[PDB]
Structures are given as structure tokens and as C-alpha cells.
Amino acid sequence: SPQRGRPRLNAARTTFVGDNGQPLRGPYTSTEWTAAAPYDQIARVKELGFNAVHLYAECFDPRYPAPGSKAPGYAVNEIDKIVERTRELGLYLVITIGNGANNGNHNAQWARDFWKFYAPRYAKETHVLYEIHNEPVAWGPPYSSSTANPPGAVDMEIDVYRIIRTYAPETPVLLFSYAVFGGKGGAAEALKDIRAFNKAVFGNENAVWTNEAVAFHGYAGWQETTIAVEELLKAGYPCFMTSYAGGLDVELTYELERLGVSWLTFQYIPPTGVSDDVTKPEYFSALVENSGLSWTPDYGNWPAARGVYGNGGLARETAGTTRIEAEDFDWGGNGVSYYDTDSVNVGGQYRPDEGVDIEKTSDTGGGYNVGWISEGEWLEYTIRVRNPGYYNLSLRVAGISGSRVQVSFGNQDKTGVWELPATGGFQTWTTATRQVFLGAGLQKLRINALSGGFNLNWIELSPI
Ligand SMILES: OC[C@@H]1O[C@@H](O[C@@H]2[C@@H](O)[C@@H](O)OC[C@H]2O[C@@H]2OC[C@@H](O[C@@H]3OC[C@@H](O[C@@H]4OC[C@@H](O)[C@H](O)[C@H]4O)[C@H](O)[C@H]3O)[C@H](O)[C@H]2O)[C@H](O)[C@H]1O
Ligand SMILES: O[C@@H]1[C@@H](O)[C@@H](O)OC[C@@H]1O
Ligand SMILES: [Ca+2]
Ligand SMILES: [Ca+2]
Ligand SMILES: [Ca+2]
């Protein structure tokens, strides 16, 4: 069977991982007011490096159970199709209740009845996880405050959890689905909610969860959301991102990858959804490609295996001058993180098992330079620009004759043709500088050798 094995908490207790130990990563679809996305459209997520699908299954009715209100269960035939199609495609599925125009709200009786019907229905589907309710409170913790808008969401979480565990004893549960989860303060407020949940459900405020995690969204922004997640992780509670958007929020994704946290992004499986289509490059694949983000996919060969050389495998951050040694190009290999015309490293130095040609340099500071740079060659360096704006881009270069380079950032040309002066010698060094406008974020710096005949020691960036 291609059916995926039950997700489980990882050893580090940071998130749910799959049957191969890898995080869950995926886009979303909806059966709230539309049919289930076709099989071939769901299949496309496998080629975009994903192994999961977020389903907004049904939208709640605030008026329920008043006359003419829409009851839960209306989409059952469409949800069954999503469950079957994900089963057969070897994908994980996270099912939740959506809100339509009523995000930051819920109807407790509607939620209890929804889960009463659906929990037993998919209990045995080992690829299916249950997320209690999307964004049930405007707009994050503490739900347990008597003045939360609206009140009683923790009672709903408790009640639905018990319903789920009665009929689906082994099914992973994602709790809270906080819209705005930000700062040490946010984590502290979430811990009030968690402690109250745990006391009611486990009889002990400090329960060690075996099959539950905190669902959250990214609307506090990447930095504050990352702080809040790190706090919650330190407190011993796993989490799972279920909805965020920047297109892909590359910055938060990078942080979640570092922290070992699974994620579902708010771009949709075609034909339809309320945001942006995940198969259009401008909303996902190009953002991943341009940034240098990498993970090992469950299916296919994309994204490429690559990353930062040195610096603990983390993106080199700008401030203040930031130096990137030419010899510290990203790992990933020929045609991926660099292109060299011969697979031998002719200089033999520093990285003898990659193709870039590297020699000891006599330049100030010593170390190494890239040499034997031939027309068409290129080198990539994954960096992170905190502050958007104009920077001085400096190349430390040498050459007997003049040469031409062009430098891209996130696959956008920032320099045009850049004529590098002859210095009269391959170890006679000069600094060439050009102003560039850089956008904020994780991005690959690419040196493109338009001609050969120059050596490159290092690259510098500093604000003008
Ligand atoms: O279908 C998914 C939808 O997304 C969920 O909200 C997310 C939230 O989880 C997080 O990721 O932040 C972004 C939120 O997205 C906003 O969601 C609401 C949406 O506007 C509503 O769109 C639906 C409209 O109504 C339906 O239209 C079709 C019709 O046939 C039906 O009867 C209508 O009810 C509604 O009036 C809009 O306010 C924004 O466009 C989007 O950015 C939601 O919980 C889930 O429903
Ligand atoms: O540094 C240079 C190299 O770039 C090449 O062009 O000739 C050999 C020297 O070591
Ligand atoms: Ca070579
Ligand atoms: Ca070369
Ligand atoms: Ca160097």
C-alpha cells in the first residue's frame, strides 16, 4: 500500500514527523463551498517537494443550530474524496474546520457535532491528522481569558479532544490554531491555555503530550512568531504551523526548518481557493529557488539538496560589513550551487572534492582565492539581508587583463555588466565596488563570470 504510516512526535519533541522521520510540508485545499480537487491536481504537490495537504473541510455556521442554519457533515462526500486521493497518493492530510468570513470566531456546538461525525469516520486512516478548529478566537492566546473574543474556546478544545479520543484514540491532534502567536509574551499566554487544557484533560497542568501539538499561524510576523515558537519548544510543547503566507513566507519557513517544525502554507491546490495558486511559480517554487531554501522531499528531486558552507550551515546575515569568502560557495554541487567547466579542482586547495578551482592567496588576510574562472562559470552563496536598501557590493579581484562579471541576488540582476579592471597580475589585488539595491530576506548571491580571466578572493556587503 502507498498509505502513509501514522505521524508521530519526533525524538526532540518539536513537531509531528512522518513514517520516514521527516516533517510534514504542504499547501491547502478546501471543500467548504466547492468540490474536492481532482486527483491529478493533488498529485502535483509531490513534484513541489510536499508530502501533506491541509484541508479546510467545512465552514462553520454561527447561527447553528437555529432553523435554516447549515449543519456539519454537508461536505462528507467531498471530504471522503480528499481522504481517498491523499491515501492513494502517499500524502498526509490535516483536516480542520474553516471559518469563511468568520475567522477569529467559532461555534462550539457546531465543532462538537462536526467532530462527533468525522472523528470516527477517519480514525483508522493512518495518513490523517485532526486540527480541532481554525482561528477560533480573535486573534490568539490566551483563549482562557474570560474576555477572549469569543469566550470558551479552551472548553471547546477540551470537549472536542475528548470526543476525538473516544472515537479516534490514535489520531494526531493539533490544538488551538492561534492566528497571532508572537513573542515571549505570546508563548506565556499560550502556556496558560495549555496548562488549563492539560489540567482538565490529563489531571496535571504539566502533561507530557504523546500525540498532540500546538497549531499556530504566522500573522505576528516571522521574527515574533519564531520567538514564541522557541519559547513553547523550551517549555516542552511540540508545535505545527498550519497557515501562513508572506506567497510563501520564506523567512518563517527558514526558521521552522531550523527548529524542526512541520508546516502548511496558505497557497491553494488548483483549480480554486481564496488566496494564491501553489503551482504558479511566483507564489511558491520561485520563492524557494530564489532564496536557497532546501529540504529533502519525500517525492521527486526538488528542491535540490544544497546549503550554506561554513557558518554552522546558517545563511550569512548582513548587519557593519559582511564578508563572504569566494571559496565558501554553497554546497550542492556542479550545476546546482556552482558551475565549473572541469570537475577537478585545479588549484587543489580547501575543497578538493568539488569542482571550483581554489588556490592559496597572497592577498592581505591570506586564506584562499577562487582562480581559473572561465567564461560561463558561476558561484552561489546563500545570505540573509535583514534591512532592505542600498548596499556597497565589493569584489576582491585580480587579473592580467580586464574581465566582465554580473551579480544576481535571488535570481534578479542587481549590477548589469560590471567591467572589472586589469590589475597586471593574478595575485595583484584590487577592490571593485558597485551600489546595489537589495530586498529583505533569505536570498542567493550569484557571481556570473561573463568572461574568464579574473580571480576572486571574497565578496563584501555594507549599507551605503
Ligand atoms: O477556504 C479557506 C479559508 O481560509 C481560512 O482563513 C485564512 C486563515 O486560516 C489564515 O491562513 O489567514 C488567512 C485567512 O484567509 C482569509 O480567509 C477568509 C477569506 O475571505 C472569506 O472568503 C470566503 C467568503 O465566502 C464564501 O465565498 C464563496 C461562497 O460560495 C460562500 O457561501 C461564502 O461563504 C467570505 O465572505 C470571505 O470573508 C479571505 O479572502 C482570506 O484571505 C478560512 O477560515 C477558510 O474559510
Ligand atoms: O591564479 C591564476 C589562475 O586564475 C589561472 O588563470 O592561471 C594560474 C594562476 O594560478
Ligand atoms: Ca574545476
Ligand atoms: Ca573554474
Ligand atoms: Ca578568500
What is each CA distance from 439 to 132, 261, 290, 318, in whole angstroms?
Answer: 38, 26, 12, 12
* 429's grid cell: 589585488
Query: Is-contact 433 464, C-beta < 8 A?
Result: no
Spatial CA neighbour of 175 closest among 229, 126, 130, 142 = 130
Strand partners, 431: 396
For cell 486512516, the residue is 125
Give the helix, strand, coil percentages of the chain, each rounded to 5: 25, 30, 45
Spatial CA neighbour of 129 closest among 51, 66, 191 = 51
Q: What whole-number distance in Å separates Cα of residue 447 and Cα of residue 407?
A: 5
Query: Is-contact 429 380, C-beta < 8 A?
Result: no
Q: What whole-number distance in Å separates Cα of residue 143 and Cα of residue 80?
A: 32
- Answer whether 349 contacts ligand 2 (Cβ < 6 A): no
* 404's grid cell: 566582465
Residue of the CA atom closest to atom 14 of ligand 1: 103
What values do phi and psi take at 47, rounded to 5? -85, -5
Query: Is-contact 229 205, C-beta < 8 A?
Result: no
Which pairing describes strands 276-277 and 25-30: parallel, antiparallel, or unpaired?
unpaired
For cell 483536516, the residue is 95
Query: Is-contact 450 406, C-beta < 8 A?
Result: yes
Going along the chain from its start, the domains and CATH numbers come out as 1-303 (3.20.20.80), 322-464 (2.60.120.260)
Q: Which ligand is the nearest neighbour of the Cα of 347?
A: 2
- Answer whether 372 contacts ligand 2 (Cβ < 6 A): yes
**What string of DSSP letters covers 364-398?**
TT-SEEE----TT-EEEEEEEESS-EEEEEEEEEE
Resolution (A): 1.6
Residue 315: CB atoms within 10 Å: 23
Residues with CB under 6 A from ligand 1: 30, 32-33, 56, 59, 98-101, 103, 134-135, 217, 243, 266, 274-275
Spatial CA neighbour of 264 closest among 40, 52, 14 = 52
Strand partners, 28: 54, 268
Q: Give the number of C-alpha atoms closer than 13 A to the C-alpha of residue 158, restricted to the C-beta side.
A: 17
3-class SS string, 176-218: EEECCCCHHHHHHHHHHHHHHHHHHHHCCCCCCCCCEEEEEEC
Q: Is the dihedral of CA 369, 375, 380, 386 positive or negative?
A: positive
The rounded Cα 73 to chain-centroid distance in angstroms is 32
Which pairing describes strands 418-420 and 403-409: parallel, antiparallel, or unpaired?
antiparallel
Spell out which residues have Cβ within 5 A of ligand 4, the ion. Answer: 340, 357, 372
- Answer whether 371 contacts ligand 2 (Cβ < 6 A): yes
Strand partners, 405: 418, 449
Query: Is-contact 419 402, C-beta < 8 A?
Result: yes
What values do phi and psi take at 453, rounded to 5? 90, 15
Q: Give the number of C-alpha atoms closer than 13 A to the C-alpha of residue 173, restricted to the C-beta side.
A: 25
Query: Is-contact 132 111, C-beta < 8 A?
Result: yes
What values do phi and psi take at 268, rounded to 5? -100, 155
Q: Which ligand is the nearest neighbour of the Cα of 371?
A: 2
Query: Is-contact 462 324, C-beta < 8 A?
Result: no
Asked if the peptide bond before residue 27 counts as cis, ω within 30 degrees of 0, the response is no
Query: Is-contact 154 144, C-beta < 8 A?
Result: yes
Angle at 450 between CA 386 and CA 317, to 5 degrees: 15
Query: Is-contact 92 127, C-beta < 8 A?
Result: yes
Rounded to 10 degrees, what is the CA torsion of 362, 368, 374, 377? -150
Out of 78, 248, 274, give the residue to mutate to test ligand 1, the one with the largest number of ligand atoms within 8 Å of its CB: 274
Atom of ligand 1 nearest to the CA of 28: 2
Query: Is-contact 205 199, C-beta < 8 A?
Result: yes
SS3 state at 254: helix
* Burial annotation 123-161 (CB, 10 A radius, 16+ → b, else e): bebbbbbbbbbbbbbebbbbbbeeebebebbbebbbbbb
122 CA to middle of ligand 4, Å? 56
240 CA to middle of ligand 2, Å? 51
370 CA to middle of ligand 5, Å? 7
